[PDB]
Structure formats: structure tokens, C-alpha cells
């Protein structure tokens, strides 16, 4: 096997410098709709509701809808206690927003009685959900249990893996780094390890002279002690 030494602390100074998530890479593509301080559970439910409202509808729409749900509460509990009228108000006026009422109002009935109040784990039983279709469930499976075929590497995830040696030997190409990583990172990890490395190489990892002076890892990197400039 391989367990790259010090890696979970690793990860988690990783996610500390990066609790602030205000990097270009991710703000440009990941999704803000959802409650930072929810559970993951409610999380889940959020993020397919998001998913369900998103069907021709601009993202200010989409966007729009969602902070007035979270503002009254957004749980698979107050969405069954919110009638058809007053949650039809709430999402307005999102593209076809009377059939998603109903999408809604049904699937959360499905999740409460099926799945304990939680979202389903498997395409097949998400396309089998009122109003989601294999689009939405292939997006659901990546955000919501981060599910994903294999890890997206690209040029901040192969520098910043052979920076804290990731792999067996230094690779040669993205490629080769993204089978060394799958043999160790757990799958829950595949598509996360992507929004947090690629944001985190942008803001300190830096391609040349990143800033380690500011870096949690300045012990933990094995080749920090030939980036650290003092006069930088
Ligand atoms: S100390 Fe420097 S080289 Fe090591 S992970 Fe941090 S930014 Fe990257």
C-alpha cells in the first residue's frame, strides 16, 4: 500500500489555511448555495434541492431561491411543513417553478419515508426521484457523497503532491500522479482533494516562490526547506 507520512495533518493545515475559501479556482466553479453550518446531512439535502431548481434558470435566480429558503430555515422538515402556495412564492420565479413545487414537496416525502430524511447514494435511485434527472444525480453523487469515477489532476494537484510527496517516486505528468493518488486517498476524497488543492496552490502553494513563510506545513513539507525565502 502507501500511506503518504503525516498526510492527514497534512490535509487538515491544508483545509486550515483554507477555511477562508476565497480563492479565484473555486469561487468561479463551486457552488455557495449551501449552509457552511449545517450537518452534512442537512447539507445533502441542500445540495439537491439546488440541483433541482437549476433547470434553465439563471444562476442569480437559482442562487436567489436558495438564500430565501435557507433564510426561513431550509430542512427536509420545514420544507414538509410549508405548503404548496407558500413555498411556490418562495422559489418564484424560478423557470418552471410550479412543477418544482411538487418535485420538491413529493421527493422530500420520499426522503423522509426511504432514506431516514437523507438523499439517496446511488444514480439509479436518484433518477428514480420526481424532477431529478441523470444530469442532477451524476452532479448530486460528486457534491453530496463526493463520489466521483477518478481524481481531477491537474497542474496545482501534481505540484502541490510532489511538493509533500504524495507518491512512491516523483512523477513525470499529471497522469501518473493521478493513479499514485488513488491508491491510497479514500473516495470520499477524490473529488474534494480537487476543490481544496487546486484553490490552495493558487493562494500559498504558488507555482514559483510559494509562501511558506505563511504555510502550516513549513514542517511537514518535505521540500520547504528549499522554497523558504527569507528575502521574498
Ligand atoms: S510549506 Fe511551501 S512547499 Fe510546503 S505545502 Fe506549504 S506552500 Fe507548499
Given at each position: 500500500?502507501?500511506?503518504?507520512?503525516?498526510?492527514?495533518?497534512?490535509?487538515?493545515?491544508?483545509?486550515?489555511?483554507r477555511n477562508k475559501k476565497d480563492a479565484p479556482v473555486d469561487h468561479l466553479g463551486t457552488e455557495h448555495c449551501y449552509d457552511s453550518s449545517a450537518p452534512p446531512k442537512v447539507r445533502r439535502?441542500?445540495?439537491?434541492?439546488?440541483?433541482?431548481?437549476?433547470?434553465?434558470?439563471?444562476?442569480?435566480?437559482?442562487?436567489?431561491?436558495?438564500?430565501?429558503?435557507?433564510?426561513?430555515?431550509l430542512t427536509v422538515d420545514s420544507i414538509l411543513q410549508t405548503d404548496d402556495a407558500t413555498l411556490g412564492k418562495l422559489i418564484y420565479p424560478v423557470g418552471f417553478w410550479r412543477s418544482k413545487v411538487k418535485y420538491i414537496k413529493q421527493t422530500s416525502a420520499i426522503l423522509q419515508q426511504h432514506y431516514g430524511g437523507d438523499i439517496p447514494a446511488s444514480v439509479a435511485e436518484l433518477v428514480?426521484?420526481?424532477g431529478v434527472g441523470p444530469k442532477m444525480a451524476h452532479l448530486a453523487m460528486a457534491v453530496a457523497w463526493g463520489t466521483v469515477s477518478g481524481i481531477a489532476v491537474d497542474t496545482h494537484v501534481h505540484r502541490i503532491a510532489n511538493?509533500?510527496?504524495?507518491?512512491?517516486?516523483?512523477?513525470?505528468?499529471?497522469?501518473?500522479?493521478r493513479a499514485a493518488l488513488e491508491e491510497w486517498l479514500p473516495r470520499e476524497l477524490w473529488h474534494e482533494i480537487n476543490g481544496l488543492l487546486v484553490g490552495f496552490g493558487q493562494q500559498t502553494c504558488l507555482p514559483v516562490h510559494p509562501r511558506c513563510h505563511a504555510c502550516l506545513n513549513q514542517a511537514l513539507c518535505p521540500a520547504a526547506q528549499g522554497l523558504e525565502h527569507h528575502h521574498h
Open positions: 500500500v502507501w500511506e503518504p507520512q503525516d498526510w492527514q495533518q497534512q490535509l487538515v493545515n491544508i483545509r486550515a489555511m439535502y441542500q445540495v439537491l434541492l439546488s440541483l433541482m431548481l437549476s433547470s434553465q434558470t439563471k444562476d442569480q435566480v437559482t442562487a436567489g431561491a436558495m438564500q430565501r429558503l435557507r433564510a426561513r430555515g428514480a426521484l420526481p511538493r509533500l510527496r504524495w507518491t512512491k517516486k516523483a512523477t513525470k505528468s499529471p497522469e501518473e500522479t
